[PDB]
């Protein structure tokens, strides 16, 4: 079965910081793939990190090939698109659906953290869905190593997306990598259950963030969220990253372990 690496473009799937992502369809084998096209006239590091990854909740990397100035990355096509488009504005989605996606998100993040990688930009636009609605983490363009030879490195680079970034990234010179990813997962959960982001950024200058710190959960988005997931959010969206809930303890949370959804 030759000619297994000959692709035909069809649709613009999206645009990232470095370039655009297009759907490409194979020749003989009829495989569909996502191809990231960046005009280099950062992606080197993105490719290196992608080569480390192999997990059911991480978008698969197939390979790379450059042509002078234009770098191509070949990646798994997720026909369900972005989680972003499953979130209904001002509504969210059914709690059992949110719970399942959150379970899969945690699985993916545990995997990454276990191999010493932090994503640094978790948000619904970077969480894709395959044909069976399985959630897959994508876009490692801001990802980096925070643990190597069993030694943790503190981060200092401000990066990510403001509504999703943890407060310590705006307040402290250095910070631990893992609690930052945990925080963004909490913002994702909030979005799934409310169809709105709670604040522009987690700063003292942001009224909506002050309200949350004051425990005004009679306001939106919190009043739309049931007491059980809201109790989890209270543990995740903690300002002090050392007091913030860790993933092992998220996995013990009452809502996290609530039977909600029937199998397929
Ligand atoms: C209304 N439209 C519905 C469909 N939609 C959409 C459709 C497909 C994708 C899509 C599918 N597989 C994909 N596989 C990927 C691998 N890496 C990336 C990346 O940004 O790094 C991005 C992708 C990626 C994006 C993303 C969005 C775009 C909005």
Specify the structural class: alpha+beta
CATH topology of the largest domain: Transferase(Phosphotransferase), domain 1
Number of domains: 2
CATH first level of the largest domain? Mainly Alpha
The main sheet comes to: 5 strands, antiparallel
Radius of gyration: 19 Å
The number of helical segments is: 7
CATH architecture of the largest domain: Orthogonal Bundle
Query: Within the largest sheet, what's the order of strands?
Result: 1-2-3-5-4
Bound molecule types? ligand 3DW
Strand segment count: 12
CATH superfamily grouping of the largest domain: Transferase(Phosphotransferase) domain 1
What string, H for helix and E for strand, traces the elements in order? EEEHEEEHEEEEEEHHHHH
Q: Assign an overall shape.
A: globular
Distance, first to last CA: 34 Å
DSSP strand (E) fraction?
15-25%
What is the helix fraction of residues, given as a range? 25-40%
Keywords: ATP-binding, Cell cycle, Chromosome, Cytoplasm, Cytoskeleton, Disease variant, DNA damage, DNA repair, Isopeptide bond, Kinase, Nucleotide-binding, Nucleus, Phosphoprotein, Serine/threonine-protein kinase, Transferase, Ubl conjugation
Protein name: Serine/threonine-protein kinase Chk1
Domain Protein kinase: 7-256
Organism: Homo sapiens
